[PDB]
């Protein structure tokens, strides 16, 4: 690769893989507009089976973006608004409860401190709808920011309804084929398994768990060649050819509320670059109730901004990071979950030096 990228990887990564006892990870720099890529280690560590540029990764959280993304593209396509409420699409939500909760506030977890998780024992359509129901918000719509697979998952299983598709369907045939993402899966083919990597908990061998609402929250699994793509779509939206999915990229890049020096966008987060990196690599607000300003109409894209999305399942760990005005990017795709400042303070430290 370029030197100024082989020298900034080989000084950071080598040392956190060591710090973190990493199985394996994958790493792609985005560097003027073209992908670098990197492995190290196993993706099955018993069958000493390396990390490759073929690798399939749990996205984790990460997958949020895709579910922001498809989202943008309903909303461009006319099919959904971010002002409708919920019980357009759940009219079995009607309650004064459910009053003014929006599909924007959905996607960006501001509907009033729904639950992180949706509990272990929902499985039926029916099991989902008491839950919703029997929900008891903490705060009004639009007031705090409580980030919940809840809220997102909810709001992806809903802005697919007036497709006529299942949200996989929809995925597949409006983001990942568009961008040509053929190894990008919610559902991995048996014949794709063979590069499946094993996650790694606490010395055991695991893959994320079936759930109410997953596809939509921490759902995807991709490649370092794949999610590379991604990092560049979103980086150059205006490259994209298909209409509704330039400008749905656009919009989940948008900014709707703001709380300190962070944003919310529609799976995306983002800041004002430069950044200060001790409040991303030390984030204070992302896994706390924020109180959030609304942003009306939402701020388009800003070119000069650190647009970023951190994922974990059981057994993975993952990052994505980019910064549009400089044309830089990093994708970090690892088989172990490890702490958040680890792999922020690490892609930082490559972009900066790169920038
Ligand atoms: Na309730």
Not at 116 to 139: I, M, T
Not at 257 to 283: A, C
């Amino acid at each position: 690769a370029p030197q100024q990228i082989n020298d900034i990887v080989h000084r950071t990564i080598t040392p956190l893989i060591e710090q973190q006892k990493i199985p394996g990870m994958a790493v792609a720099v985005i560097y003027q507009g073209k992908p670098y890529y990197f492995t190290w280690g196993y993706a099955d560590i018993a069958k000493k089976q390396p990390v490759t540029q073929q690798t399939l990764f749990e996205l984790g959280s990460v997958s949020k973006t895709f579910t922001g993304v498809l989202g943008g593209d309903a909303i461009a396509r006319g099919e959904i608004k971010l002002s409708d409420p919920t019980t357009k699409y759940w009219p079995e939500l009607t309650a004064k409860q459910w009053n003014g909760i929006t599909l924007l506030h959905l996607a960006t977890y501001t509907a009033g401190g729904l639950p992180l998780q949706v509990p272990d024992e929902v499985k039926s359509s029916s099991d989902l709808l008491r839950f919703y129901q029997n929900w008891q918000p903490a705060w009004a719509p639009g007031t705090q920011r409580l980030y919940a697979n809840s809220s997102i998952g909810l709001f992806g299983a809903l802005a697919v309804k007036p497709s006529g598709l299942s949200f996989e369907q929809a995925m597949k045939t409006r983001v990942f084929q568009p961008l040509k993402l053929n190894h990008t899966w919610i559902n991995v083919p048996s014949a794709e398994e063979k590069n499946y990597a094993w996650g790694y908990r606490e010395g055991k061998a695991v893959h994320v768990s079936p759930r109410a609402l997953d596809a939509e929250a921490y759902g995807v699994k991709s490649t370092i060649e794949d999610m590379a793509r991604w990092v560049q779509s979103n980086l150059k939206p205006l490259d994209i050819n298909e209409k509704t999915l330039q400008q749905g990229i656009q919009l989940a890049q948008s900014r709707y509320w703001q709380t300190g020096d962070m944003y919310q966008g529609l799976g995306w987060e983002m800041l004002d670059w430069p950044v200060n990196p001790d409040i991303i690599i030390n984030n204070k607000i992302a896994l706390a109730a924020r109180p959030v300003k609304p942003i009306t109409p939402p701020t388009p894209a800003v070119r000069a901004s650190w647009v970023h999305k951190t994922g974990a399942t059981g057994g993975f760990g993952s990052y994505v990071a980019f910064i549009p005005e400089k044309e830089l990017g990093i994708v970090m795709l690892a088989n172990k979950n490890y702490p958040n400042p680890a792999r922020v303070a690490a892609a930082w430290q490559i972009l900066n030096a790169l920038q």
